[PDB]
C-alpha cells in the first residue's frame, strides 16, 4: 500500500562513545561533542550526542524518538543522518559531528570572509537536500539558517527533524494542531490554516536564503510575531539584501507567493542557483571577493 | 680619500604625521604606529615613529642621531631605511611601518603555520641585507631574530642600527670599548677582544638562523652570559634543531668557526640557502608542510 520503511535503527552501547565537551544546551536538553569507537573496528568517529534534560517528560521522550525515526530514514549528502541511539536513562541521539556548527552563526562570525561562491553554493546544497526530502515524501516544517549545519565551509547539511512529517502517497498536505512553530519562517497558509506542504518548505527556504544573503540578520527584526500574519497579507515581504542582484532577490520573492503552486520547486531552485554559481559575481556584489590614498613607504620614493 | 656619503637627511614636520597607537616601550623610549601625510601629495604612508624617553640624556640623544645617520645611509629591499627625523623636544626617528613586527615574535606565535619555504626564504633575505651592508662597508654588531622586522610574511628587512659602525677603506675591523652587547649572539673574538668584522656578523647570522629554525628558542636558555665565553672556547655550540637536516645545520656550524675567515661570506650564504629554497622539504623536515584512526562518519558506512 505504501513503501515499507526498511531503515535500520542502530542501537549503540554507551561504552562505545565518549563525551568530550558540551556544545550547547537550550530547551531541548544538551548536545555533546564526542568520539564513537566501535569495539570491533579500528575507527574513531567524531559524533554529536543529543539528549533531553536529565528528567523524563512522557511527551518529550516520544518526540526524540520521532526525530530518530525521521533522521534514521534519510540518506543524502546534504541531509543529516542518524548514526544510532543509546538507550540510557534518557534516550541519546547520535549523529556525525558538524564541527563548524550551524550556518546562521557561521555567516555572522565570518561576514568579512564569505564570498559569493560560498553563499550561492550553500543555496544549491540546501536546495538539493530539500529536494531529496521532497522525493522521500518528507515535509521539514522548520527550515532555517539555524537548522543547517556546516561539516566544512564548502559542505552543509540540513538537520533538526523534530517537527518533520511523512506524507502518504495519496496525501498533499499536513494539518498541524499544537502550533508553536517559528512564525517568521513559515508560509502564510501555515499561519492562517496550519497547512504544511513541500511548497511551505520553499517559503522557509526563501527566508533561509535571506538570512544567508544578509549575513545572519534576524527577519522582521523589530516586528512581534503577532503582527507577522497581517503584514504578509498586505503584501509586505523581507527587503532586498544589499549584496543581492535583482536576479537573486527575484528568486527569494518567488518563494513568497501567496499561491503555493506559483512558488518554485526545489528542483528548479537547484538549477537556477547552480547556473548562478558558475558566475557568482554577476549575481552577488560583495566588496571583498580607513583610506584609499594609502601608499607603502617603499613605493613613495623621496622627492 | 673616502667615498663621500651624500645621503639626504629629510626633516619632517610634526603636523605632517599622526600617532595612532603605541607599539612598544623598552629602555629605548617608545615606538609609535602612525600615518605620514606629506602636505603637497595625495599620499598616506604608514610609519613607525621612535623617540627616546621624554627626558634628555646628552649621550642618548647623540646615539639616536647615530642610528639616524646609518639608517639614512642605507638603501636595500632587505634593510630598513630612515624616512626622516622630526626635531621636537626629543628627536623622533621615522621609518616604514613593518606591521607584522619583529621576526622573533612572528616565528613564536606562528610555529604551527610556518613552512620550510618561508624559513629558508627568510634566511636568503637576511643574507642579502647583510651582504648589502657588507658592500656599504657597514658592520651591524647586533643581528638577531628580534632585529629583523616583517613587512609581510614573505618579505623581511634588517633594522636596529644603534650599534652599527662604518669601516674605512683601509680598515678591516672595529674595536669596541663600552661593551654591553648581547653576549649570546656575538663571535668569540668579539667577547674575548671586542673585535667586530663582517665575519663577526656572520656568527650572529648563524645564531639568528638557529632562532628561526627552533621557532624562536632562546639561545643557551639555561646558561648565564658569564659562562658563554668559556663554553665556546671548549667547542660547545648551539644544538641541531629538530627540523634541521645536517645540510642546513652544517651551514650554521660553519658560521661559528673560531677562525673568522673560515666562516662563509654572506654572498655564499645567499647562494647556499637559495639553492635549498628551490627544494625546501629536502632541507627542512616539518610535520605540517589526537588520533590517526579517526574517520569521518560519512566514510564509515554502516556494517
Ligand atoms: O541541532 C541538533 C543537532 N546538533 C548538532 N548535530 C551535529 N553536529 C553539531 O554540531 C553542533 C555544534 C558544533 C559546534 C559548535 C556549535 C554547535 C551542533 C549543535 C549543538 C548545539 C545546538 C545546535 C547544534 C550539532 C543534533 C541532532 C541529533 C543528534 C545530535 C545533534
Ligand atoms: O626597532 C626599532 C624600529 N621599530 C619598528 N620599526 C618599523 N616597524 C616596526 O614595527 C614594530 C612593531 C609593529 C607591530 C608590533 C610590534 C612591533 C616595530 C617595533 C616596535 C617596538 C619595538 C620594536 C619594533 C617597528 C624603529 C627604528 C627606527 C624608527 C622607528 C622604529
Cell triple for B50: 621612535
3-state SS track over A140-192: CCCCCHHHEEEEECCEEEECCHHHCEECCCCCCCEECCCCCCCHHHCCHHHHH
* Residue ranges matching CATH 3.30.200.20 in chain B: 2-97
Using CB atoms within 10 A of its CB, is residue A252 exposed (0-12), middle (13-18) or buried (19+)?
A: buried
Of all helices (H) and strands (E), which one includes residue B198? helix B198-213
Cell triple for B232: 665556546
Please say whether the beta carbons of A251 and A273 come within 8 A.
yes
Residue B13 to residue B210: CA distance in whole angstroms: 42
Q: DSSP assignment of B116-174, as one string? A: HHHHHHHHHHHHHHHHHHHHTTEE-S---GGGEEEEETTEEEE--GGG-EEPPTT---E
Distance in Å, CA A78 to ligand 1 centroid: 15
| Nearest protein CA to atom 22 of ligand 2, as residue | B24
At residue B156's C-alpha, the angle toward residues B153 and B160, to 5°, is: 135
Q: Are B46 and A77 in contact (CB < 8 Å)?
A: no
Residue A278 to residue A196: CA distance in whole angstroms: 33
Q: Which experiment gave this structure?
A: X-ray
Residue B243 to residue B221: CA distance in whole angstroms: 19
Ligand 1, pocket-test mutation among A52, A101, A147, A160, most atoms within 8 A of CB: A101
How crowded is residue A230: how many other Cβ atoms within 10 Å of its Cβ?
Answer: 10
Q: What is the CATH T-level fold of the domain B2-97, as seen in this structure?
A: Phosphorylase Kinase; domain 1 (3.30.200)
Distance in Å, CA A98 to ligand 1 centroid: 7
> Does the annotation list B24 as a binding residue?
yes
List chain B residues with CB under 8 Å of A47: 297
Catalytic residues of A: 142
At residue B187, what are phi and psi to the nearest 5 degrees? -70, 160
List all residues whose CB is within 6 A of at least one atom of ligand 2: B 23-24, 31, 48, 50, 93, 95, 97-98, 101-102, 149, 159-160
List chain B residues with CB under 8 Å of A8: 302
> What's the count of helices (H) and strands (E) in chain B, helices before strands?
8, 11
Instruction: Please say whether the structural domain B98-290 has been given the CATH code 2.60.40.420.
Output: no
Q: Are A45 and B95 in contact (CB < 8 Å)?
A: no
A97 shares contact with chain B (CB less than 8 Å): yes
Cell triple for B238: 648551539
* Whole-number CA gyration radius for chain A: 22
Angstrom CA distances, B61 to A5, A132, A156, B68, stand at 87, 76, 62, 11
Residue A203 to residue A238: CA distance in whole angstroms: 12
Please say whether the beta carbons of B137 and B212 come within 8 A.
no
Using CB atoms within 10 A of its CB, is residue A47 exposed (0-12), middle (13-18) or buried (19+)?
A: buried
Residue B228 to residue B220: CA distance in whole angstroms: 8
Task: Provide the phi-psi class of A222: left if phi over 0, else alpha when psi is between -120 and 50, else beta.
Answer: alpha
Angstrom CA distances, B130 to B65, B137, B255, stand at 22, 10, 14
Of all helices (H) and strands (E), which one includes residue B269? helix B266-278
Please tell me whether residue A34 adopts helix, strand or coil conformation: strand
> What number does the ligand 1 atom closest to the CA of A98 have?
8
Give the residue carrying C-alpha cell 545572519: A216
Q: Report H helices in chain A.
A: 58-72, 103-108, 116-135, 188-193, 198-213, 225-234, 246-254, 266-278
Angstrom CA distances, A230 to A192, A201, A224, stand at 10, 20, 11
**Listed residue (B29, B132, B146, B157) closest to B81, CA to CA:** B157
DSSP-derived secondary structure letter, A102: B
* Residue ranges matching CATH 1.10.510.10 in chain B: 98-290
* Percentages of chain B per state (helix, strand, coil), in multiples of 5: 40, 20, 45
Distance in Å, CA A159 to ligand 1 centroid: 9
Q: Which residue of B has its CA nearest to A296?
A: B45
* Whole-number CA gyration radius for chain B: 22
Residue B301 to residue B303: CA distance in whole angstroms: 7
> Does the annotation list B26 as a binding residue?
yes
Q: Are B294 and A45 in contact (CB < 8 Å)?
A: yes
Of all helices (H) and strands (E), which one includes residue A245? none
At residue A133's C-alpha, the angle toward residues A131 and A137, to 5°, is: 115
Q: What is the resolution of this structure in A?
A: 2.7
How far from each other are the two terminal CA atoms of chain B, in whole angstroms?
88
Q: Are A297 and B46 in contact (CB < 8 Å)?
A: yes
List chain A residues with CB under 8 Å of B81: 298
Task: Provide the phi-psi class of B141: left if phi over 0, else alpha when psi is between -120 and 50, else beta.
Answer: left
Using CB atoms within 10 A of its CB, is residue A176 exposed (0-12), middle (13-18) or buried (19+)?
A: middle
> Does the annotation list B226 as a binding residue?
no
Ligand 1, pocket-test mutation among A159, A160, A162, A164, most atoms within 8 A of CB: A159
Q: Are B96 and A297 in contact (CB < 8 Å)?
A: yes
Closest Cα in chain B, distance from residue A295 (Å) = 5
Please say whether the beta carbons of A119 and A212 come within 8 A.
yes
Q: DSSP assignment of A58-76, as one string? A: HHHHHHHHHHHHHHHT---
Give the residue carrying C-alpha cell 675591523: B173
Amino acid at each position: 500500500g505504501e513503501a515499507p520503511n526498511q531503515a535500520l535503527l542502530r542501537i549503540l552501547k554507551e561504552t562505545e562513545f565518549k563525551k568530550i565537551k558540551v556544545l550547547g544546551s537550550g530547551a531541548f536538553g544538551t548536545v555533546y561533542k564526542g568520539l564513537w569507537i566501535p569495539e570491533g573496528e579500528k575507527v574513531k568517529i567524531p559524533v554529536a550526542i543529543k539528549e533531553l534534560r536529565e528528567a523524563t517528560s512522557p511527551k518529550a521522550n516520544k518526540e526524540i524518538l520521532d526525530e530518530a525515526y525521521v533522521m534514521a530514514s534519510v540518506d543524502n549528502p546534504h541531509v543529516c543522518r542518524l548514526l544510532g541511539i543509546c538507550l540510557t536513562s534518557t534516550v541519546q541521539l547520535i549523529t556525525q559531528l558538524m564541527p563548524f556548527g550551524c550556518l546562521l552563526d557561521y555567516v555572522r562570525e565570518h561576514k568579512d570572509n564569505i564570498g559569493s561562491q560560498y553563499l550561492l553554493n550553500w543555496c544549491v546544497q540546501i536546495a538539493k537536500g530539500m529536494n531529496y526530502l521532497e522525493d522521500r515524501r518528507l515535509v521539514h516544517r522548520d527550515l532555517a539558517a539555524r537548522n543547517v549545519l556546516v561539516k566544512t565551509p564548502q559542505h552543509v547539511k540540513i538537520t533538526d527533524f523534530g517537527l518533520a512529517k511523512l506524507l502518504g502517497a495519496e496525501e498533499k498536505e499536513y494539518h498541524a494542531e499544537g502550533g508553536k512553530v517559528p512564525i517568521k519562517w513559515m508560509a502564510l497558509e501555515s499561519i492562517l490554516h496550519r497547512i504544511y506542504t513541500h511548497q511551505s518548505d520553499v517559503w522557509s527556504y526563501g527566508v533561509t536564503v535571506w538570512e544567508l544573503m544578509t549575513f545572519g540578520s534576524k527577519p522582521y527584526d523589530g516586528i512581534p510575531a503577532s503582527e507577522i500574519s497581517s503584514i504578509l497579507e498586505k503584501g509586505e515581504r523581507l527587503p532586498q539584501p544589499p549584496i543581492c542582484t535583482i536576479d537573486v532577490y527575484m528568486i527569494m520573492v518567488k518563494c513568497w507567493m501567496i499561491d503555493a503552486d506559483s512558488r518554485p520547486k526545489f528542483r528548479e531552485l537547484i538549477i537556477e542557483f547552480s547556473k548562478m554559481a558558475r558566475d557568482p559575481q554577476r549575481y552577488l556584489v560583495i566588496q571583498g571577493d580607513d583610506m584609499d590614498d594609502v601608499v607603502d613607504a617603499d613605493e613613495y620614493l623621496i622627492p
